[PDB]
Amino acid sequence: ATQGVFTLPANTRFGVTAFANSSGTQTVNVLVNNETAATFSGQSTNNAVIGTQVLNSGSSGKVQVQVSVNGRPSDLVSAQVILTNELNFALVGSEDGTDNDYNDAVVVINWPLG
Amino acid sequence: ATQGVFTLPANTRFGVTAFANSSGTQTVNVLVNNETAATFSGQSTNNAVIGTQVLNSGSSGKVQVQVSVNGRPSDLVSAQVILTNELNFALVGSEDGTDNDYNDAVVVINWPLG
Amino acid sequence: ATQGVFTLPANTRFGVTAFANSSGTQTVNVLVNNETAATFSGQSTNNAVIGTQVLNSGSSGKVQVQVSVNGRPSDLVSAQVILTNELNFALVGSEDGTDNDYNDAVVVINWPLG
Amino acid sequence: ATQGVFTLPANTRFGVTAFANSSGTQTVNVLVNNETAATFSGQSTNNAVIGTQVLNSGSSGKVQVQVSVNGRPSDLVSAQVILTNELNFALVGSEDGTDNDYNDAVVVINWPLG
Amino acid sequence: KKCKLCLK
Numbered sequence: 265a266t267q268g269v270f271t272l273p274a275n276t277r278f279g280v281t282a283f284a285n286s287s288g289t290q291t292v293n294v295l296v297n298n299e300t301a302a303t304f305s306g307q308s309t310n311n312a313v314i315g316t317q318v319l320n321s322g323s324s325g326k327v328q329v330q331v332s333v334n335g336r337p338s339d340l341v342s343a344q345v346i347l348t349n350e351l352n353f354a355l356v357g358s359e360d361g362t363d364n365d366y367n368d369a370v371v372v373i374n375w376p377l378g
Numbered sequence: 379a380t381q382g383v384f385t386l387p388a389n390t391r392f393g394v395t396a397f398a399n400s401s402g403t404q405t406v407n408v409l410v411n412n413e414t415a416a417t418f419s420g421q422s423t424n425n426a427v428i429g430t431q432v433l434n435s436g437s438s439g440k441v442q443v444q445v446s447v448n449g450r451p452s453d454l455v456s457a458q459v460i461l462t463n464e465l466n467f468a469l470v471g472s473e474d475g476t477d478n479d480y481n482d483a484v485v486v487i488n489w490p491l492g
Numbered sequence: 493a494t495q496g497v498f499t500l501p502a503n504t505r506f507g508v509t510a511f512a513n514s515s516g517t518q519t520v521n522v523l524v525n526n527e528t529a530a531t532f533s534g535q536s537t538n539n540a541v542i543g544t545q546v547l548n549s550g551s552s553g554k555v556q557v558q559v560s561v562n563g564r565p566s567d568l569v570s571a572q573v574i575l576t577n578e579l580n581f582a583l584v585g586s587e588d589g590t591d592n593d594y595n596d597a598v599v600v601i602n603w604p605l606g
Numbered sequence: 607a608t609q610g611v612f613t614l615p616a617n618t619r620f621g622v623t624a625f626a627n628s629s630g631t632q633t634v635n636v637l638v639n640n641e642t643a644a645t646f647s648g649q650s651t652n653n654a655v656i657g658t659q660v661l662n663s664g665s666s667g668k669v670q671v672q673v674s675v676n677g678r679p680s681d682l683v684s685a686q687v688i689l690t691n692e693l694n695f696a697l698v699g700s701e702d703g704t705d706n707d708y709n710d711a712v713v714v715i716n717w718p719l720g
Numbered sequence: 721k722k723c724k725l726c727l728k
């Protein structure tokens with residue numbers, strides 16, 4: 265099934281933050297309304313923040329995360345969770361190899377902000 | 379019910395990251411085996427990453443998140459999510475006032491690392 | 493000249509606080525004895541406190557502030573000022589662009605504490 | 607000499623941030639145009655931010671800081687520092703007792719913002 | 721509360 269694609273409320277600010285747990289350099293693309301809105305890159309085996317940014321969900325509210333390692337697309341796992349019917353998390357894990365830990369690039373989208 | 383308390387696998391490295399979305403200055407304390415192991419603080423209404431750190435769950439694996447604003451404890455919401463039976467997220471939201479957006483301090487714990 | 497490096501009295505607790513005034517996401521690293529001791533990330537054009545922390549100057553007393561935006565080191569300006577021969581401020585300004593306002597990330601270190 | 611009084615450029619946004627280092631609760635008053643514009647209060651012996659605020663210097667540009675503990679005004683020390691002829695710091699320390707560490711309430715004013 | 725001008 266499709267992973268890393270989330271429908272947010274339209275015209276809503278959201279934060280997006282990426283961590284890296286791999287010896288491969290992670291490339292994280294965040295698309296809004298099918299256009300790349302942010303790109304993070306970095307390498308860490310110690311969960312370092314390779315990028316964080318505030319974006320707007322736009323007229324469609326469609327947010328997509330894509331992870332690649334030197335041109336190789338990472339397999340993604342994702343889910344959305346809502347706490348007390350107000351606080352939202354859009355969570356993405358990614359796997360760039362065969363060890364099946366899916367932490368090579370971790371992406372956390374959260375909203376609302378402010 | 380108790381919130382912000384998570385049992386991790388013992389002696390496992392985990393990441394903890396705090397985001398702020400409030401006019402009040404947030405103070406986030408992370409306890410491992412009931413002992414304060416990390417403290418983050420900051421003031422932002424734009425989801426600033428006021429702290430991120432790698433900790434060890436120790437022999438007990440007990441991790442607790444506490445949030446306070448100028449001495450007053452915030453109300454907490456929490457849950458744990460596991461993707462593809464391997465990737466763990468421990469999520470915490472907090473409310474310091476009356477609007478009930480529960481984003482005033484947002485804490486994300488993730489494991490395993492590396 | 494070298495900027496952003498301060499020799500503090502050895503084994504002394506100090507506060508460090510970072511403000512953001514830029515459309516770019518600011519990453520502030522505080523190194524003690526050449527090892528990263530605190531990291532703050534965030535984006536704000538309204539002087540948000542993207543992080544505050546209490547650290548120890550260690551046996552070397554060497555404290556360094558680094559600022560980078562999108563992986564590019566900002567240009568730093570710094571100085572130390574002492575009030576009534578007791579109260580110490582270490583101040584850091586940084587520029588990530590072409591406007592030369594040098595407030596894109598502002599770091600204030602103060603000691604003694606308690 | 608008068609302390610804690612600074613003449614800013616008129617109608618200019620500035621940040622004001624207060625830290626506490628005393629067993630007595632600190633009360634920080636920020637006056638603009640000889641009128642109270644912000645009031646912070648908190649207690650900490652660990653440099654906690656008891657308040658941070660963005661204000662406007664008004665038509666006169668006159669900003670004044672007052673500090674009191676249990677109704678007793680603290681003795682103030684202050685100075686202004688300007689880096690690369692652009693970045694401004696107005697620094698205030700205060701002493702509420704006898705040890706003369708002058709960190710009991712520390713107030714940092716910085717401008718320009720944005 | 722507001723008079724005072726208590727702010728965060």
Ligand SMILES: *C(=O)C[C@@H]1O[C@@H](C)[C@@H](O)[C@@H](O)[C@@H]1O
Pocket residue numbers: 378399400401402423473474475476477478479480482728
């Ligand atoms: C205090 O003002 C309450 C507070 O700050 C607002 C800016 C908003 O973030 C709100 O959720 C928070 O509780």
Ligand SMILES: [Ca+2]
Pocket residue numbers: 286359360361362363364365366367368
């Ligand atoms: Ca992997």
Ligand SMILES: [Ca+2]
Pocket residue numbers: 285286365366367368491492
């Ligand atoms: Ca990995």
Ligand SMILES: [Ca+2]
Pocket residue numbers: 400473474475476477478479480481482
């Ligand atoms: Ca709230």
Ligand SMILES: [Ca+2]
Pocket residue numbers: 377378399400479480481482
């Ligand atoms: Ca909020």
Ligand SMILES: [Ca+2]
Pocket residue numbers: 514586587588589590591592593594595596
């Ligand atoms: Ca600038």
Ligand SMILES: [Ca+2]
Pocket residue numbers: 513514593594595596719720
């Ligand atoms: Ca700026």
Ligand SMILES: [Ca+2]
Pocket residue numbers: 628701702703704705706707708709710
């Ligand atoms: Ca004192």
Ligand SMILES: [Ca+2]
Pocket residue numbers: 605606627628707708709710
């Ligand atoms: Ca003191």
